[PDB]
A paper describes a structure:
Crystal structures (<2.0 Å) of the B. bacteriovorus histone (Bd0055) dimer and the histone–DNA complex confirm conserved histone-fold topology but indicate a distinct DNA-binding mode. The bacterial histone Bd0055 from B. bacteriovorus HD100 is structurally similar to its archaeal and eukaryotic homologues but, rather than wrapping DNA around its outer surface, binds DNA edge-on and oligomerizes to form a dense nucleohistone fibre that completely encases DNA in vitro.
To understand how Bd0055 binds DNA, we solved the crystal structure of Bd0055 in complex with a 35 bp DNA fragment. This structure shows that Bd0055 contacts the DNA with only one L1-L2 binding interface across the minor groove. The molecular details of this edge-on interaction are very similar to those observed for other known histones. Surprisingly, rather than the DNA bending around the positively charged histone surface, the DNA maintains a straight trajectory. The filament is stabilized through protein–protein interactions between histone dimers that involve the basic DNA-binding ridge and the acidic underside of histone dimers 1 and 5, and through exchanging N-terminal tails between dimers 1 and 4. This nucleohistone filament, which is characterized by a histone to DNA ratio of 1 histone dimer per 2.5 bp, reverses known histone convention by completely protecting straight DNA from the solvent. The crystal lattice we observed suggests the possibility that bacterial histones might generate higher-order fibre packing through the interaction of histones on adjacent nucleohistone filaments.
Author numbering:
A (entry chain H), B (entry chain D), C (entry chain H), D (entry chain D), E (entry chain H), F (entry chain D), ...: 2 to 64
Write the structure that this text describes.
């Protein structure tokens, strides 16, 4: 259930910017990264008493 | 540019798992996170001498 | 009998310079071009009474 | 740089079909002709919207 | 020019019947055997004043 | 069963080099000759303790 | 630390009996199966107050 | 026949992790377990249409 990335555009980016192919399992791991980022965003909004996940709730300072 | 996440499923997961809405720019920064994961993947693959970004090249331990 | 081009290096050139794949039948047509160029080189050397095909005998002014 | 022709078979074809030797730089310019055919092939494929250099993209009618 | 054997089916036969791999140069030698067999078949038909190579013109009594 | 020769190129070589046609069963027996060469190749490789049928295992001196 | 299967003989068995290749990660999973079987054998001997793992302590009734 | 486990490391793991000795036929049945896992792996791969026994073909959930 639920693939959260747009496969064709991810592949195009990796081909265009990196001159590489993309494994199918790569798409799966990226989808799981999105899942984890949204779950943390929801916990970050709830800890602030808001009802909307905002860009500031998406934490990528470890990126 | 370029939306790399499936917006409808991101919103559906956030509403279904946290009851919240999803701001517009949340999609934007989720997409930026994908771009960065993909570009690190290309660097990981290049350092392995490979031409394919594989699951092993996408590290999401910090998320 | 006789493939006259170095397949792996032709493919690498097209991938590197053109960001493209190479069909197997492409290698065949390039080999036939080499065959035609050598046959004309031999006729060009013979018309000059020489026993050696030289660079000047390889005509690519139609290129 | 980069030799794109199979030198031993080029020499063997020239000796076997014309009884002649093959100068060193004959290989060099045969290789240059390959580079040019490949680069025109990439342009032909791009104008077709393709990502693969195919036999149809290598025109050797003038040779 | 001209590979006269069907590579994939030759490899399958050697793998299936002999439990072995097949070198690429093996395919070349088999193609040359076919070339020699057809050239002799043409000489055998011509010596009989026929215009068609037939099975009887393919001599493998030395096999 | 199994056609092991490239019929179109066999016919083209026979018409181009001898001006003749090629009967149907000529292909069949050419294919049988391939089967026999391959099976002798497997025996040659086995007697060398190898697992790969190589050019050295295909003897076509008698043809 | 510790590869518990004899790689070359496992590969030979799969090639001989199954006519197949063996992935390197296959050897790893088999080693882990051996590790799990010995750990259970030790618990089975201890539960009987013995100091020696015996064949009867190696349980493969789920096999 | 054929010992498929590394006896010295099996014994060392059993002595180091349980302080016990290892009977002779324990090695024998550990080896039989390997044979059976490999033969099920071949069946799993065949049902996938593959020619390689991979990690996915070795199921050790029941152990």
């Amino acid at each position: 259930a639920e693939v959260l990335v747009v496969t064709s555009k991810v592949k195009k980016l990796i081909k265009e910017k990196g001159q590489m192919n993309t494994s199918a399992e790569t798409i799966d791991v990226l989808s799981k990264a999105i899942e984890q980022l949204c779950l943390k965003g929801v916990e970050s909004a709830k800890a602030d008493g808001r009802k909307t996940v905002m860009a500031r709730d998406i934490v990528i300072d470890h990126l």
